[PDB]
Design a protein around this ligand. Structure first.
Ligand SMILES: CCCCCCCCCCCCCCCCCCCC(=O)O[C@H](COC(=O)CCCCCCCCCCCCCC)COP(=O)(O)OCCN
Ligand SMILES: CCCCCCCCCCCCCCCCCCCC(=O)O[C@H](COC(=O)CCCCCCCCCCCCCC)COP(=O)(O)OCCN
Ligand SMILES: CCCCCCCCCCCCCCCCCCCC(=O)O[C@H](COC(=O)CCCCCCCCCCCCCC)COP(=O)(O)OCCN
Ligand SMILES: CCCCCCCCCCCCCCCCCCCC(=O)O[C@H](COC(=O)CCCCCCCCCCCCCC)COP(=O)(O)OCCN
Ligand SMILES: CCCCCCCCCCCCCCCCCCCC(=O)O[C@H](COC(=O)CCCCCCCCCCCCCC)COP(=O)(O)OCCN
Ligand SMILES: CCCCCCCCCCCCCCCCCCCC(=O)O[C@H](COC(=O)CCCCCCCCCCCCCC)COP(=O)(O)OCCN
Ligand SMILES: CCCCCCCCCCCCCCCCCCCC(=O)O[C@H](COC(=O)CCCCCCCCCCCCCC)COP(=O)(O)OCCN
Lengths: 50, 50, 95, 149
């Protein structure tokens, strides 16, 4: 449609365009933290992988 | 304190990595500016009496 | 910091059969080098500000001048005067 | 930047001096160094932080600027001291290889010149200091004049 006609979202639609998802991003942090803690407890970089 | 860590390099490395991560996260959420906020608040009242 | 680095060592060293003058001389002799290292590291680090230029350089130069010259002169005078301070203070305020 | 390396420099220099002048394996040379200089670090840190503590206790634009400077300075210094106590010994005992007998010696070029010059400077400084201590009255008036000026 020509100029002079725009679009806006409402309700649930607002946050979808305001951003997607970031669950995978945080799931990685929880793994690095656990790896670091286990490495400190074991005193070795190789065991925490098990 | 110094004798405890002389035998546990990995635990010290873990603490250092935690500090580095915290610093990066803090940097990621800091506003930038020229000078700190130094101006005091002011309120103005407007009246008309033709 | 520079003064304490010598004062504390001299105090620890005199507590064992060392006179005031002997302790002061030994402390100065042993602590000379680290004092110079730590002072000149700071001086060389702050040199970049001393010769600043471009955008927002006035404040950089203003801080650099004072910090640079104060540190240099203070270190040069302290390395020679601190032992005298220790000896005089110990001699007057006995114990 | 130039202040956070003071404690690490002190520790490393002490351990290096012990190793060079006593021929000691690094792991226990580090423990001896930590025993000798475990109090200088705390003294230096306390002295540094006690001066920046009062900067953050004023009001106004000047007070805001003082706080912004002082809090950053103090936090960085405290973290540097903690790191020097914690991590420096571990690396100095594990990641630092043994010093070959006389490895630091026999330097040629710039380094040997610098070593000779620094030895001469140290000798002259000790000779001057040993003298300035037999005149404890004139030097006090000199100091008073310097302070007045
Ligand atoms: C979403 C998934 C996210 C999961 C993240 C989990 C943590 C990922 C980092 C794991 C790093 C493993 C390093 C490792 O174990 O290998 C070491 C050497 O690596 C080597 O093979 C050679 C050294 C170079 C490896 C450097 C590793 C850095 C990788 C970090 C980014 C990934 C083994 O050494 P050791 O355990 O036997 O040492 C014993 C000392 N006591
Ligand atoms: C206005 C009024 C208030 C003003 C406040 C101003 C701001 C204050 C800022 C304070 C900053 C302090 C930072 C210090 C960081 C390092 C602290 C180390 C303390 C310490 O050396 O004692 C060690 C404790 O170990 C142990 O006992 C085992 C526990 C180890 C963790 C203890 C430290 C806590 C976490 C860090 C053992 O001593 P040492 O072996 O290190 O050397 C001998 C030292 N003389
Ligand atoms: C800056 C953040 C620092 C967080 C990490 C600080 C680590 C301090 C480790 C001190 C461990 C320690 O020597 O004593 C531990 C007790 O902790 C304590 O009593 C104090 C814990 C404070 C954290 C367990 O004692 P140990 O089994 O390691 O050997 C010593 C025999 N008491
Ligand atoms: C974020 C998560 C992904 C990055 C952080 C994961 C850290 C995992 C480090 C694993 C390193 C394993 C390789 C390794 O053994 O390095 C040892 C120390 O290096 C080290 O300890 C490297 C320290 C790395 C510091 C910089 C990384 C910070 C990034 C944090 C971002 C958040 C040296 O041991 P060696 O293998 O040479 O064997 C001879 C031992 N005597
Ligand atoms: C070893 C660890 C290295 C530490 C480097 C920390 C970099 C932090 C990157 C995260 C980040 O978002 O930086 C953005 C890129 O800025 C930049 O342009 C980075 C410039 C610094 C690069 C040179 C680093 C000095 C050496 C700006 O941050 P932002 O725009 O996302 O939001 C900030 C609102 N306060
Ligand atoms: C205007 C006022 C400004 C005030 C500023 C004060 C700044 C002072 C900052 C550093 C002060 C030193 C704090 C901790 C060091 C005190 C002596 C530690 C000696 C030590 O290692 O004892 C171990 C246990 O102490 C420990 O475990 C320490 C636990 C704490 C064993
Ligand atoms: C054998 C041994 C015998 C021991 C001796 C016997 C006992 C004697 C004890 C004497 C104690 C000293 C009495 C001084 C009275 C206090 C003076 C006013 C203090 C004050 O207003 O607060 C200060 C205002 O600084 C500010 O930030 C606001 C700006 C105003 C500052 C200008 C005031 C001049 C300060 C000059 C030094 C005064 C003494 C300071 C200690 C900040 O300090 P604070 O209220 O937060 O208290 C620290 C709590 N942790």
């Amino acid at each position: 449609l020509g100029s002079g006609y725009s679009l806006e979202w409402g309700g649930q639609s607002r946050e979808e365009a305001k951003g997607g998802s970031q669950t995978i991003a945080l799931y990685a942090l929880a793994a690095v933290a656990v790896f670091l803690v286990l490495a400190a407890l074991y005193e070795s970089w190789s065991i925490p992988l098990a | 304190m110094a004798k405890f860590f002389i035998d546990r390099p990995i635990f010290a490395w873990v603490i250092s990595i935690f500090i580095i991560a915290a610093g990066i996260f803090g940097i990621k959420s800091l506003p930038v500016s020229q000078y700190p906020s130094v101006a005091a608040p002011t309120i103005t009242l407007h009246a008309i009496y033709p | 910091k520079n003064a304490i680095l010598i004062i504390e060592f001299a105090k620890d060293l005199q507590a064992q059969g060392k006179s005031a003058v002997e302790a002061a001389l030994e402390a100065a002799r042993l602590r000379f080098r680290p004092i110079i290292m730590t002072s000149f590291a700071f001086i060389l680090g702050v040199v970049p500000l001393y010769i600043a230029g471009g955008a927002s350089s006035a404040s950089q130069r203003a801080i650099g001048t004072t910090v640079f010259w104060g540190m240099l002169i203070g270190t040069l005078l302290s390395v020679f005067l601190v032992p005298l301070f220790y000896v005089v203070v110990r001699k007057f305020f006995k114990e | 930047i130039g202040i956070v390396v003071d404690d690490a420099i002190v520790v490393v220099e002490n351990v290096e001096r012990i190793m060079a002048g006593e021929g000691l394996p690094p792991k226990e040379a580090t423990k001896k160094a930590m025993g000798q200089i475990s109090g200088a670090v705390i003294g230096i840190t306390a002295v540094l932080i006690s001066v920046f503590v009062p900067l953050a206790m004023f009001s106004g634009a000047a007070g805001n600027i003082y706080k912004q400077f002082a809090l950053t300075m103090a936090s960085s210094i405290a973290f540097s001291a903690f790191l020097a106590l914690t991590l420096t010994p571990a690396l100095c005992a594990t990641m630092l290889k043994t010093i070959p007998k006389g490895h630091h010696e026999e330097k040629k070029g710039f380094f040997g010149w610098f070593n000779k010059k620094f030895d001469s400077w140290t000798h002259g400084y000790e000779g001057r200091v040993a003298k300035v201590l037999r005149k404890t009255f004139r030097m006090m008036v000199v100091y008073i004049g310097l302070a007045v000026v």
